Design a binder for these strands. Structure first.
Lengths: 97, 81, 104, 94, 93, 106, 83, 97
DNA sequence: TATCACAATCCCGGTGCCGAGGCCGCTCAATTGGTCGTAGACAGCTCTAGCACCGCTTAAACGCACGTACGCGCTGTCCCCCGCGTTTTAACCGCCAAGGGGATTACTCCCTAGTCTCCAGGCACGTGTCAGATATAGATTGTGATATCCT
DNA sequence: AGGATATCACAATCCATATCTGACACGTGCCTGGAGACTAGGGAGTAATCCCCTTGGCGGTTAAAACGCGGGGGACAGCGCGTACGTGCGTTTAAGCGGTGCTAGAGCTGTCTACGACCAATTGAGCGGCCTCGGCACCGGGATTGTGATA
């Protein structure tokens, strides 16, 4: 039947997610990930229901900020696809490791 | 105990994160890589958070602990405490 | 009696700000012009950000400033986005911005 | 019973004076309160360091004015210094 | 003639005990003195903020221990803690 | 009269560091152990950097530590380069390093 | 009093080539020189303005080494070797 | 007579300047540039002979640090030449403007 | 694909010079000893408040088939960037005179801490109304496939 | 016989409206902390010197920069092609919600106790300043990998 050409559902998704301001990761998998990470620093911890929310907001802001720079670095090389080379280059220019 | 939760950051979640960032087309090897990045960021923050907590002799990681852990990496977060 | 924050035409509490400076371990002695000056600049920054936020909320057919509008009005201004260098705003979304190469 | 102080009523006064017909949600007020705390601590810390480099012991208006000039960029700092001067003058006129 | 109050001779002592046959220039002495100053200011600032968050008023050794655990990265913060604890313990004796 | 540095087994000054804490406006009152602890960490970090710098200077048949050797010994250490992250060192040069894709292929 | 004009062209091409070589660059395009002069001018304004603020705060006219060191430190560019 | 192929004098220069630690800009043009810039913030200033030295050290460290990232960004795009696109990309990723 | 002549690079070493190390006198600040107010460690208690589980949905994830466009690889052009040689222009070094500004010291007068008191401004708590969110529906729109008009 | 191209059809976004709940604006009670008023005081403004150190000038050397030519190599354009990513459909599965019980931790209050500030006096450690030398730069010169031209 109908079939959108590759690169219009993508732009509609871009325009939809850049507009709304929800949380993009499912709260429960992220909370379990946070607890599994914290297991290595103090056994039998306890997390407020808002500390996890702050960690998730910070994490999503960080990943979005990283993908913006990865996209710039990908466009720099005559492309539109982003590959791990771009992420690693962005994280090297920004000074992380 | 919990094992292998970094797979909870599913591939569609990463697609949505990239779409908010402005990416039109994502390679197939990004996803795994991205998880790595995430699993490092948290390790650098949560640790500080825990350090800010067991110093106050407490046992519950507050939201101010996370806010301070962020602030001491130049990543201030407005909205929590 | 007469309030100090209202003695200088301000809206931010000069008394509370002065007590915070004193009991905050910044210097030993703290003048009486420091509280008023600090409160004046704090109120100016609040007025500017709130004005731009209200404008951005009206240009979106709403009546209540939500975090979305403060993020919009902060990233969409030069000096303010310079003052907000590394600030994440919870529930702020991002600026709507598609590149030029990705367009059809 | 415990209490905590915030800049809620002051930010709300400023809003009702600059935008008389516009409310402000709860989360936005928490954001503006965090913003005020942060800018306050930045200006005050820089002023402390300034009054410590010159071996002084008093954070007068001079230190706050210079700290505002150092932190706020460009046209922001100019207007902020102007407002601070006007306020100090009005108050000193008793 | 006001006095200049630096960490020159202490850095020199440490060097002469850890590398007994090598000297140190004047530029390198200035660099190490400024380095000690900067690390001192970082650690003291963090200890101050830690005392301030917990509604305390004293900078005990607990706060300096935590400030070191925050600023110094990875494996350094273990040996620095060991040295500090050993020094305090020998002081109390 | 014995110096507190000697009692605590250090070389760095405990008295001077304690005073510097008391008059720096860090808190209202400062405990006895804080000075000793801070001095111990300062001396340890100094020992680390100076040891590595002396090594890097001996690798050039030079018996004197210059800024160049401090830079070489700090950038070639993961943890110290993480501690000197945003720091410039005057007269320090940079690390000898050429990217692969610039060398002549054959 | 002197008035100096057109000094950014004093940073000549071979100096920029030397900087690039130290940075590790093998081949330099021809339009990098004006761009580098621009970047340099911007950084220098940003640092000299803070240095002059620190100087004229302490009621002085002589921009001291420590005023520059502070103007740099308050940009996250700590500079060991002049304090 | 003799003629080195393009790309060996370059590498010899790279190996020579990465090794020595002098100052790479002539002191007098840089000092005049600093004074001409400061003219716009306070007329009839006065510079210590060491403040100019600190400004020059900071400036050269900044420019070297920028050229390292520009070189990475140029190699990213299948090149060895560095163009203004690379400098602008590096200064955008690092967060400057 | 193996060999040759030349253009840096490196090491030996000899001189000097100069920047590091040793040493002296003072002087300022670290140490010692009481005395005291002060905050901080400690036990109990009441109450949140985060953890655990479970039932039930249902929205979101996963896996597969396909087929389209994008990354990549090869070739060719020619523009532009490096190497090299000459000339000269402006940096470097230094010697120095003016002088302008920064540091110091003593006075003093202004502005801030400390303390008790008391009133009024701010915070927790209820209360109800208004605006954001949700559900349908219609009209506006932007995208994609196609017959038709050109070469 | 295919491309251009205006043209026709269809899924998605967006106003317009009712309606609905919850989240904010508003009034109230109470408390705690800010404002006066007085006292003591010590820190910053003012003045005067003075010494030092920064600007300006010049004058000589000399090496770094500017220019101009010439050759090569590398960046860009152009095309083919293979694959790998987006799109869509259908099944399944955990995430969300809400709800209840449990206990663990946390904030608060009184209680004590040990500890750190304050002050007065003492001496020793360290700093500025003057000598003495040994590591480093600097130059000449011999030996050594390396690089483009030969074959």
């Amino acid at each position: 039947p109908h079939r959108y050409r590759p690169g219009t559902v993508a732009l509609r998704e871009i325009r939809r997610y850049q507009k709304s301001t929800e949380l993009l990761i499912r709260k429960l998998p992220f909370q379990r990930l946070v607890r599994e990470i914290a297991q290595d620093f103090k056994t039998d911890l306890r997390f407020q229901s808002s500390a996890v929310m702050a960690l998730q907001e910070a994490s999503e802001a960080y990943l979005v900020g990283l993908f913006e720079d990865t996209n710039l670095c990908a466009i720099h090389a005559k492309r539109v696809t982003i590959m791990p080379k771009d992420i690693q280059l962005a994280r090297r220019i920004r000074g992380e490791r | 105990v919990l094992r292998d939760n970094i797979q909870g950051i599913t591939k569609p979640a990463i697609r949505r994160l990239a779409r908010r960032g402005g990416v039109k087309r994502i390679s197939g090897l990004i996803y795994e890589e991205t998880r790595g990045v995430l699993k490092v960021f948290l390790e650098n923050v949560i640790r500080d958070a825990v350090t800010y907590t067991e110093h106050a002799k407490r046992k519950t990681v507050t939201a101010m602990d996370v806010v301070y852990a962020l602030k001491r990496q130049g990543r201030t977060l407005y909205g929590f405490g | 009696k007469a309030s100090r924050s209202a003695k200088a035409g301000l809206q931010f509490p000069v008394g509370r700000i002065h007590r915070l400076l004193r009991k905050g371990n910044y210097a030993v002695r703290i003048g009486s012009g420091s509280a008023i000056y600090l409160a004046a600049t704090l109120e100016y920054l609040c007025a500017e950000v709130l004005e731009l936020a209200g404008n951005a909320a009206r240009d979106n057919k709403k009546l209540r400033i939500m975090p979305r509008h403060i993020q919009l009005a902060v990233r969409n201004d030069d000096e303010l986005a310079k003052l907000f260098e590394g600030v994440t705003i919870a529930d702020g979304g991002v600026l709507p911005n598609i590149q030029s190469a990705l367009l059809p | 019973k415990s209490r905590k102080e915030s800049y809620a009523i002051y930010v709300y006064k400023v809003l009702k004076q600059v935008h008389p017909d516009t409310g402000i949600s709860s989360k936005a007020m928490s954001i503006m309160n965090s913003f005020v705390n942060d800018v306050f601590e930045r200006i005050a810390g820089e002023a402390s360091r300034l009054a410590h480099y010159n071996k002084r012991s008093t954070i007068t208006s001079r230190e706050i004015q210079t700290a505002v000039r150092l932190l706020l960029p460009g046209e922001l700092a100019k207007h902020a210094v102007s407002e601070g001067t006007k306020a100090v003058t009005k108050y000193t006129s008793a």
